[PDB]
Design a protein around this ligand. Sequence first.
Ligand SMILES: N[C@@H](Cc1c[nH]c2ccccc12)C(=O)O
Ligand SMILES: N[C@@H](Cc1c[nH]c2ccccc12)C(=O)O
Ligand SMILES: [K+]
Ligand SMILES: [K+]
Lengths: 339, 360
Amino acid sequence: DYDKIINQFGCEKFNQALADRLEKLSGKPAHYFFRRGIVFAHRDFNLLLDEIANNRPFYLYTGRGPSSKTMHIGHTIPFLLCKYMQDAFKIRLVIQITDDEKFLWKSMRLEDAMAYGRENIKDIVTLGFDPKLTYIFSNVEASHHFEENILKISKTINLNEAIKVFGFDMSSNIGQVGFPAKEIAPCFSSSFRFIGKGAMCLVPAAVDQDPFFRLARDKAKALGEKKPSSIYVSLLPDLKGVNPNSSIYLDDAQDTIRKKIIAYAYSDIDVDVPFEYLKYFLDDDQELEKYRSGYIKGEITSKEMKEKCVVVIQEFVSRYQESRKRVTDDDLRAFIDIN
Amino acid sequence: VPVAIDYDKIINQFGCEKFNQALADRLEKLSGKPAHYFFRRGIVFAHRDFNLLLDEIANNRPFYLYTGRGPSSKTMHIGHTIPFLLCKYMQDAFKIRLVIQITDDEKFLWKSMRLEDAMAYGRENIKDIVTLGFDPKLTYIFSNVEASHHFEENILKISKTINLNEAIKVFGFDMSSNIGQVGFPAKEIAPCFSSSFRFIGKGAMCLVPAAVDQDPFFRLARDKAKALGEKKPSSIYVSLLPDLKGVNRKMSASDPNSSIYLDDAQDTIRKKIIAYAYSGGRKTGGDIDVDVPFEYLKYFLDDDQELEKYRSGYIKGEITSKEMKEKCVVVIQEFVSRYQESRKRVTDDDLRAFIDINKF
Ligand SMILES: N[C@@H](Cc1c[nH]c2ccccc12)C(=O)O
Ligand SMILES: N[C@@H](Cc1c[nH]c2ccccc12)C(=O)O
Ligand SMILES: [K+]
Ligand SMILES: [K+]
């Protein structure tokens, strides 16, 4: 229930007026995420759209927390949204890899969290962001470049707030408690040398990242910075239709994919996982529409739905692996270089 | 109580060991050279595991010193020089490394200050410290803001081992504390571990000369040593020089008029001491135990026999309070003057050598 999720976090409901505006402003149709309700919520997107209308530049900011097995396809969603956004407005993108957060939260040696951090970057670079417009960084290694901001953010946030907003308690470690300043800092242009002096930030994130951003927004004025704007993506469910072997991984083979879908995909179009997967990955609106119409009229079977989902997901992973196989460890360096 | 302090109540309220003359003797044998007068005159009163640091030395194992200063807007008073003098000595006696954390972060995080200022003040305090004349080849002085990231791993590892329950019980944090403050003790703890500095031997033991008010950081550091696979730091504690009325053995300054500052003119030093220094003298021997001028000498008179001569003479009424004050004036005066002429000669080249982690 998406209205209840919006109510709990207290952000705004996304709407199609905002998609039209974005389409109008980009001279190209809004990415289908905005059209299919995958982007369902926001804070101040209108204001970021106003920034584009006034031909002022904005920049994107998103993050990823390590915890490596291979990444699955659900993990690509905000990053795809950033790719489209970068390619539409040829704008800069900063990606935070939270090796520190994963270390501080999970039972994990730091070297491993950092090691997973690097693979996640290789995996993320795969989606083909512009190296001249994208800065991806490890927190452990590189959040000190905006140390001043971290301190400044940290000073404005008392434990009272930290607890209420994040649910810390007497057993939270003092790293966890300090960490939100490191997630908030990249929300401000002053955090990066390579970004214009008062560029607005746009933060595409799982809705569940919101508290960082309501908070960042509350402290912006006190810090003399522009309020970031944010947009939220629904989370792709696993194939059973929920949140192990029923996720679709980025290193799954073509046959592994056809297996997982035929076996586990729950098959009434509001409950149908194969359609839902299609909502997220099938490029063609006229095509997707055929299947929504088709299943609804009973002119298409669950067998056919599964199988169209199969080939679409197969087209996606195959594109991904074709690029992945070619990401050299040299290529990784262009993205993490600050200088 | 002007000079006299119940050192044992201070030692018990913290959980540390008391210093003894056995440890100074051990220090003499091991360095060949005599033990710094700090160790002989009661100024090093408490410690944790100094016997073990001595055992490291005796075992041809290296150690390093670590100490700190939070920068302030204000000129620091001569009291502030005490643990840094102890380091200068320890460094020269063992030709060992020293790391000095300037906590511009802490001062920013705790005070009503722009970060820019804390950092500026930090940079002045590095000039202030270098003045005391350390070995450029063995001393790393750094700002936390610029430089603590070279040990962000240790900060992160340390941060994992300290929960809020503990952070509060130990440091007195509350709901109105900011989250920078709460995380800060990991940053003070980190330099206790040789791995926090690339240029120090794999597992060299740390020795922290400190005000006892700093113990909680080190008790905690020692508690997390095993957790981190690191050697427990040793710690020795200095009794703080009192103000001229005695009493305020705070690193913080009470009534400026009753403290001697590193920028006081010679006549101010005389005026201040003669006017406000509380004396042991009787109405009409002398009461050494409360005599503030003698206490100052205990801290600053680099000559043992001359100290003994004033002590003796005082106890048997052979020396007057005016005379004790007088000698106290000359000693403080010379110390401040040598300090000030040294400050002038400190170039930025001097400074840049102390500041650069690449030197080692
Ligand atoms: N903490 C997030 C990662 C992250 C950091 N910064 C972000 C900004 C936007 C979205 C996500 C992030 C996670 O565990 O996944
Ligand atoms: N909290 C200390 C600063 C400090 C950091 N590390 C230290 C090590 C030793 C002594 C003091 C310090 C102070 O303001 O005094
Ligand atoms: K900037
Ligand atoms: K080391």
